[PDB]
Design a protein around this ligand. Structure first.
Ligand code: CLR
Ligand code: OLC
Ligand code: OLC
Ligand code: OLC
Ligand code: OLC
Ligand code: OLC
Ligand code: H8G
Ligand code: MG
Length: 358
């Protein structure tokens, strides 16, 4: 005991910011009805994972730092504590991958129960991924102990576990994020194309002298609206006048079509800027998970590669540092939501003032 007493002051700060911030997230998705969507339902499940990592794993870790990385508890709790840490971390990364995938599929498409079934699937996948760690590690203390330190000692568990709980969900998540960004760039682009078509043909109709010019322009306007409804019917109403030779009537109907076009373009176009706003916040969450966990997972693989060549006491001392940089990620998602989403910031501000009604 008290082999390192300076380090555990800092780790208590990281434990408290984790518990309290993620309690504010869980409260905001439970209570604030502007946050009742499928992405925020996933962000709450991530927050429970971050909270249970802060309650269950992180105090036991600080306890080991206070005992000189020398396991202070009953010995069959070591494999359980490895299992909790690996379960919450597997759940977190496949949540971010499910968010990224479900939001990409939403931009190639037109219930809380449907979100909640998916969350349960991610958690039940994560329990089955993490399952060999107590099943094998409780039967053999050499898979979870290294010189009285509780740490995942089995090299095949580290390699299998580094890919199926960090690198293959990351790969799917970074591909789906890029494709999502490209889809939004295609949808902001196709809209601008439809705007130019509609605006150009309205100017054609306003200068038109013959029915044929008006009819052709309205046919091209109808197609643009169909590519992007009330507008289509209004265009068809102008088309019948144009087919009837009522040029002046069709021209007056077209100046009225303009107000409807402005409303629809700005709405579908407000909702493209909002999806790019939302994608940008999830990108910071995705980025901060990877960059803060990269020094732990790269070094953990390098321990297994240069097992004998490298200084196992330096590598072991760097992993003790780098696991807490990764634990610090559990404090950061609530801060990201505060900085970039008004609804979370307002929710957090009222919950701190013990005002729980909207
Ligand atoms: C990001 C990853 C960085 C921070 C990690 C990943 C791999 C790590 C290296 C792996 C192997 C060794 C050899 C050892 O004898 C000294 C430390 C050293 C040189 C590590 C330094 C830190 C390191 C470069
Ligand atoms: C949103 C709900 C998220 C529910 C969070 C439940 C996570 C806890 C859990 O699933 O525990 C597994 C258990 O340890 C198996 O042995
Ligand atoms: C904010 C990030 C968290 C802060 C520090 C974590 C560093 C943990 C490393 C603690 C140092 C103890 C160590 O590595 O050596 C122990 C040795 O057995 C006897 O001192
Ligand atoms: C899914 C979770 C894994 C299943 C069971 C947990 C195993 C429980 C470990 C036993 C509790 C520790 C204890 O109290 O005693 C330890 C023993 O005395 C020292 O050898
Ligand atoms: C097919 C029948 C074989 C049964 C007898 C085998 C005995 C060998 C020991 C362990 C196996 C581990 C199972 C690995 C299967 C995938 C587990 C996984 O996905 O990850 C492991 C875990 O995440 C770590 O971090
Ligand atoms: C950023 C941290 C960089 C940490 C770099 C640690 C270098 C330690 C080192 O070079 O130690 C060699 C060892 O004593 C014998 O192989
Ligand atoms: C139990 C706490 N201890 C002992 C000091 C740690 O070393 N914790 C780290 C272990 C991890 C690990 C190692 C190997 C394969 C893996 N697949 C998924 C993970 C993982 C999660 C990862 N967690 C987030 C940090
Ligand atoms: Mg033009």
């Amino acid at each position: 005991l008290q082999e390192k007493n300076w380090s555990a002051l800092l780790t208590a700060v990281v434990i408290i910011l984790t518990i309290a911030g993620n309690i504010l997230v869980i409260m905001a998705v439970s209570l604030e009805k502007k946050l009742q969507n499928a992405t925020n339902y996933f962000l709450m499940s991530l927050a429970i994972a971050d909270m249970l990592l802060g309650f269950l794993v992180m105090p036991v870790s600080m306890l080991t730092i206070l005992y000189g990385y020398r396991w202070p508890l009953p010995s069959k709790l070591c494999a359980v504590w490895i299992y909790l840490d690996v379960l919450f971390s597997t759940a977190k990364i496949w949540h971010l991958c499910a968010i990224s995938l479900d939001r990409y599929v939403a931009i190639q498409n037109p219930s809380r129960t449907k979100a909640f079934l998916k969350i349960i699937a991610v958690w039940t996948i994560s329990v089955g991924i993490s399952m060999p760690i107590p099943v094998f590690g409780l039967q053999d203390d050499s898979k979870v102990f290294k010189e009285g330190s509780c740490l995942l000692a089995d090299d095949n568990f580290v390699l299998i576990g580094s890919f199926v709980s960090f690198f293959i969900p990351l790969t799917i998540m970074v591909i789906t994020y890029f494709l999502t960004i490209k889809s939004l760039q295609k949808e902001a682009a196709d809209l601008e194309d439809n705007w130019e078509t509609l605006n150009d043909n309205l100017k054609v109709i306003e200068k038109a002298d013959n029915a044929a010019q008006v009819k052709d322009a309205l046919t091209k306007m109808r197609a643009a609206a169909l590519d992007a409804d009330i507008l289509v019917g209004q265009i068809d109403d102008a088309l019948k006048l144009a087919n009837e030779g009522k040029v002046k009537e069709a021209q007056a109907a077209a100046e009225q079509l303009k107000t409807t076009i402005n409303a629809y373009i700005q709405k579908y176009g407000q909702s493209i800027s909002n999806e790019q706003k939302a994608c940008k916040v999830l990108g910071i969450v995705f980025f901060l998970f990877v960059v803060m966990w990269c020094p732990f997972f790269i070094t953990n693989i390098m321990a297994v590669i240069c097992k004998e060549s490298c200084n196992e006491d330096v590598i072991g001392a760097l992993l003790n540092v780098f696991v807490w940089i990764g634990y610090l990620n559990s404090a950061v998602n609530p801060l990201v939501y505060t900085l970039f989403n008004k609804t979370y910031r307002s929710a957090f501000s009222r919950y701190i003032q013990c005002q729980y009604k909207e």
